[PDB]
Amino acid sequence: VVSIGVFDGVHIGHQKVLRTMKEIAFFRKDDSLIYTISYPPEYFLPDFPGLLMTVESRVEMLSRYARTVVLDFFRIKDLTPEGFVERYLSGVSAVVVGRDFRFGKNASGNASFLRKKGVEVYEIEDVVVQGKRVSSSLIRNLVQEGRVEEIPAYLGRYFEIEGIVFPTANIDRGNEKLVDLKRGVYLVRVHLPDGKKKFGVMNVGFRNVKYEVYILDFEGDLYGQRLKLEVLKFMRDEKKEELKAAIDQDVKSARNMIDDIINSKFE
Numbered sequence: 001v002v003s004i005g006v007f008d009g010v011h012i013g014h015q016k017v018l019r020t021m022k023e024i025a026f027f028r029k030d031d032s033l034i035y036t037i038s039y040p041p042e043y044f045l046p047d048f049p050g051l052l053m054t055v056e057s058r059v060e061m062l063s064r065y066a067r068t069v070v071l072d073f074f075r076i077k078d079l080t081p082e083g084f085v086e087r088y089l090s091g092v093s094a095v096v097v098g099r100d101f102r103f104g105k106n107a108s109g110n111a112s113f114l115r116k117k118g119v120e121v122y123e124i125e126d127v128v129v130q131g132k133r134v135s136s137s138l139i140r141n142l143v144q145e146g147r148v149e150e151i152p153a154y155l156g157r158y159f160e161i162e163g164i165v166f167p168t169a170n171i172d173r174g175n176e177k178l179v180d181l182k183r184g185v186y187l188v189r190v191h192l193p194d195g196k197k198k199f200g201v202m203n204v205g206f207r208n209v210k211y212e213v214y215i216l217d218f219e220g221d222l223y224g225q226r227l228k229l230e231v232l233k234f235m236r237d238e239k240k241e242e243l244k245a246a247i248d249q250d251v252k253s254a255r256n257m258i259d260d261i262i263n264s265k266f267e
Contacts, residue, residue, distance in 0.1 A: 001025045002089070003096040004035045004071075004103065006136070009052035010061045011155045013098070013127040013134040018065045020124055021096040025066075028094075032066035035088060039073045040136075041107075043177065049140040050179035052155070057162055081109045085117055094120040129153050146182030146234045158189070158230035161202070161211055168203075168212040169222050171229070180209045185235040185250055187257050190215055191228040201247070201254050202229065205238055214247070216254065233257050 003021040007014045018034070025032045038055050042048050051058075055070060062068040076084060081104045089095065095114060101123070103109035111121040126133045134154045142151055143159055151159045161181075163171040186202045190213065202213040213229060235250060235257070 001028070001030050001094040001096065002033045002035055002092050003066075004037070005097060005101070006037050006040050007034075007058060007062060008040065008136040009139055009155055010058060011052075011134055011136065011139060012129060015156060016127050017096055017098055017124045018062070020122060022065065024094060024096065024122065030094070034062050034066050034068040035071050036062055036068055037071045037073060037076070037103075043073070048177060049137070049144060050177040052136060052139060052143070052179060053160065053162065054174050054176050054178070056174070057160075076103070077105075079104055081113050081117075084109060085114070085119070089114075089119065092119065094122065096122045096124065098124055099126055140179050143179045143181055146184065146186075148181070148186065148231045148234055151231075158232060161188070161229045161231060162227070163211070164226060165223055168214050169227065171211040171213065171227060173211065180204070181231065182234070183209070183238040185238075186231050187233040187235055187254050187261075188213060189230040189232060190218075191230075192218070193222065193225045193227070199254065199258050200229075201235070201250050202231070214251070216251070232261065 001021055001024050003017055005014070005017065021032060021034070024030070036055075036058065039051075043051075059068055059070065071088065079087070084104050097111070101110060111123050114121045128134070130153065132138060139151060139154050139159070142148070142154070148159055161171060161173065163173040165172055181204050183204045183206065186204065188200050188202045190198050190200045192198065198215055198218050200213045200215040202211060204211055235253065
């Protein structure tokens with residue numbers, strides 16, 4: 001069995017699609033394969049907010065669901081249905097995909113066609129959270145608007161900032177088009193290479209946004225190491241020498257949103 005799609009974020013709606021694949025595989029003692037198109041159709045438009053995560057990260061996640069192969073956006077945006085079906089979908093008896101799904105030249109590919117060629121298609125309905133259709137765009141807007149706290153209800157977890165490499169550590173998020181968080185300061189949960197986990201204050205400021213994070217109760221530097229940050233809360237907005245005091249306020253303020261997040265956990 002196979003599931004075809006973008007899966008930017010691999011959010012609640014994507015999961016629904018992947019679990020169903022696994023359920024079908026189980027009752028057929030069949031094998032599993034996820035085909036993930038590298039980039040959505042508007043990725044190149046100037047008005048594209050950007051991907052929730054890199055294709056790499058996306059793959060590390062789709063992985064804890066089944067072997068995953070990346071279908072290169074260009075190597076397929078010019079194929080006729082026969083061409084696609086005939087090249088990645090052979091020997092395949094079943095495919096799992098979201099509501100309305102397309103895949104070939106001029107976007108003329110779909111369930112109905114797949115069915116005409118002897119392929120069983122499972123169209124998974126969208127997951128509605130609150131009163132909206134979970135989607136990568138919705139989470140994409142929530143990220144720019146800085147409304148992080150409201151992300152887990154759709155993504156199924158905290159929006160994450162991932163990348164390479166006293167005061168801070170600047171995070172290089174790689175070279176794909178990644179959505180950016182509204183500028184300002186955010187409380188974050190830092191996953192250190194150590195295995196250990198600490199909290200921190202992240203500054204997001206200036207087309208090419210920087211991500212610097214000050215880590216609480218932590219020594220040594222992470223130059224060259226990979227880092228993962230769960231973004232919890234939007235603290236204050238961006239603002240222009242009373243600096244050595246404004247950050248010190250932020251810190252003392254970080255501690256106390258931390259306490260209140262922990263407290264809430266004990267219930």
